[PDB]
Amino acid sequence: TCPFYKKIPGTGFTVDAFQYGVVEGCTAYFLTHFHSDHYAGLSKHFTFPVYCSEITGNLLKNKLHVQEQYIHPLPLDTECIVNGVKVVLLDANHCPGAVMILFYLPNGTVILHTGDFRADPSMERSLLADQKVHMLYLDTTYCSPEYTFPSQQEVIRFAINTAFEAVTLNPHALVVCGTYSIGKEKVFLAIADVLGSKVGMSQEKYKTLQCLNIPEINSLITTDMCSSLVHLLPMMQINFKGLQSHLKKCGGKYNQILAFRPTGWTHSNKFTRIADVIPQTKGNISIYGIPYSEHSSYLEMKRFVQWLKPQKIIPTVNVGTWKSRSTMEKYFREWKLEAGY
Ligand code: NI
């Protein structure tokens, strides 16, 4: 049965609700982004209207074989009308194609659903600036003050500098980057760019990336692993055994692996700046865990909400324990008292 925080009141709409069969009273299903926890249940047999971004639509058609007639892509930053309700899709600064949704209800209520997001001050100058929001359904993934992390830019600078130095010192080193879903493409693309290489990957992963419009993609990615010194592997293979084996598969082209595991958060951020990060090493294999997040830090989230000043906040993450729920509600109270709303 569909939870309440996936239902938009005063509409026949749901958000990221495909794993519950036919939702009672749902006339249109919105999908914020192409991550499995959100799309789970879509397939070729789906025959209700799905509203999403252009990129998300491309992925629905090609990867899941959803039929074209049921896919309704909307342009960003554009007032559109769905079953008589004005809607706008806004960039969520999450993975490619990820959106937030603004709903303008017939009675005058305005609702923002963030989907998954990484709050940024650039959002303070989109269509949000111009009006009040009565209800915010908020991505609360990292809603606690221990979750502090660097900017994506600082993390990429660290990665590029590390990889460039390693391959310069040993031209026979291979760089590996882990992946488990779309998102975090900048990690591997920025590395390949500095080394003068393409990123080699499986045919299935190549086809996924080709679905995303990213300009100059024929230009940065390939299925020819032999001609590439940056390889993309499943995140599960980013460990000493998986990587020893990969190295075996390369037929003596390389004698060393430097691997990156972009993670959300790790407790080393509580004690260590980006510049201080060091690898785990075993033989000729080093693994760096880097804090590349596509979700708001605590402070990013706090600033977004104190700017927006919603009348009611509905959390969409960490809602399953009484202790988590209580903790988040206590922060929301603080934020409201400090900002004067
Ligand atoms: Ni996500």
Question: Are 98 and 53 a contacting pair, CB within 8 Å?
Answer: yes
SS3 176: strand
d(CA 151, CA 130): 27
Nearest in space to 166 (alpha carbons), one of 175, 158, 157: 175
Whether residue 167 is found in the same domain as residue 267: yes
d(CA 332, CA 315): 10
For residue 58, report the distance from its CA to the centre of ligand 1, in Å: 17
Whether residue 167 is found in the same domain as residue 185: yes
Whether residue 94 is found in the same domain as residue 188: no
Report the run of H or E that residue 88 belongs to, with start and end.
Answer: strand 85-91
For residue 296, report the distance from its CA to the centre of ligand 1, in Å: 12
Q: Name the β-bridge partners of 313.
A: 136
d(CA 180, CA 306): 33
CB atoms within 10 A of CB 136: 24
For residue 114, report the distance from its CA to the centre of ligand 1, in Å: 11
Whether residue 152 is found in the same domain as residue 285: yes
Q: How many domains are contained in the chain?
A: 2
DSSP for 181-220 reads: SS--HHHHHHHHHHHT-PEE--HHHHHHHHTT--TTHHHH
CB atoms within 10 A of CB 44: 10
d(CA 316, CA 117): 12
User: What's the gap between Cα 130 and its chain centre?
Assistant: 26
For residue 168, report the distance from its CA to the centre of ligand 1, in Å: 35
Method: X-ray
Residue found under tokens 């499986």: 202
d(CA 148, CA 197): 33
User: What's the gap between Cα 334 and its chain centre?
Assistant: 28
Whether residue 233 is found in the same domain as residue 220: yes
Q: Is the dihedral of CA 165, 168, 174, 175 positive or negative?
A: positive
Whether residue 218 is found in the same domain as residue 164: yes
For residue 94, report the distance from its CA to the centre of ligand 1, in Å: 7
DSSP strand pairing (285-290 vs 280-282):
antiparallel
For residue 115, report the distance from its CA to the centre of ligand 1, in Å: 8
For residue 180, report the distance from its CA to the centre of ligand 1, in Å: 11
Whether residue 221 is found in the same domain as residue 128: no
* Resolution of this structure in Å: 1.7
Residue found under tokens 């058609």: 61
For residue 245, report the distance from its CA to the centre of ligand 1, in Å: 30
Whether residue 143 is found in the same domain as residue 241: no
Whether residue 19 is found in the same domain as residue 153: no
210: exposed, middle or buried (Cβ count in 10 Å: 0-12, 13-18, 19+): middle
Helix, strand, coil content of the chain in percent (nearest 5): 35, 20, 45
Question: Are 139 and 300 a contacting pair, CB within 8 Å?
Answer: no
d(CA 339, CA 333): 10
Residues in the chain after which the chain is broken, C→N over 2.5 Å: none
Instruction: Print the domain residue range for 311.
Output: 1-147+296-341
SS3 285: strand
Whether residue 309 is found in the same domain as residue 274: no
d(CA 46, CA 18): 9
Whether residue 172 is found in the same domain as residue 276: yes
Residue 12 sits in a domain whose CATH number is: 3.60.15.10
Question: Are 116 and 301 a contacting pair, CB within 8 Å?
Answer: no
d(CA 142, CA 266): 12
For residue 116, report the distance from its CA to the centre of ligand 1, in Å: 5
Residue 284 sits in a domain whose CATH number is: 3.40.50.12650
For residue 335, report the distance from its CA to the centre of ligand 1, in Å: 25
Residue found under tokens 């799905």: 50
SS3 243: helix
Question: Are 29 and 18 a contacting pair, CB within 8 Å?
Answer: yes
For residue 251, report the distance from its CA to the centre of ligand 1, in Å: 37
Buried b (16+ CB within 10 A) or exposed e, 300-339: bbbbbbeebebeebebbbbeeeeebeeebeebbeebeeee
Residue found under tokens 């934020």: 335
d(CA 150, CA 95): 18
Cα separations in angstroms, 303 against 132, 270, 338: 16, 20, 11
CB atoms within 10 A of CB 266: 14
Whether residue 173 is found in the same domain as residue 284: yes
d(CA 41, CA 3): 15
For residue 35, report the distance from its CA to the centre of ligand 1, in Å: 5
